[PDB]
Amino acid sequence: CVHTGNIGSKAQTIGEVKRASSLSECRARCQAEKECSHYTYNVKSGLCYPKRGKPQFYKYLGDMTGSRTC
Fold this sequence. Notes:
By secondary structure, the chain is mostly beta strands. The chain has one domain: Hepatocyte Growth Factor. The protein contains 1 helix and 6 strands, in the order ββαββββ. The strands form 2 sheets. Strands 2-4-3-6 form a 4-stranded antiparallel β-sheet, with helices on one face. It has a two-stranded antiparallel sheet with strand order 1-5. This is Micronemal protein 4. It is found in: Cytoplasmic vesicle, Secretory vesicle, Microneme; Host early endosome.
């Protein structure tokens, strides 16, 4: 649900990519958008990708995709 994985999602980010100091932060960033079904937190650059709609998973080292909430 919210344990790293290193999987990126090709699902459209619901807005501008905001950087998050933690994956936890990016979770709250997803909790913000009602459309957000999951988020891809790129821990590597520290970027948070709150993503809407259905997901699409790919192997990206650094991308932690939390399924919105666990």
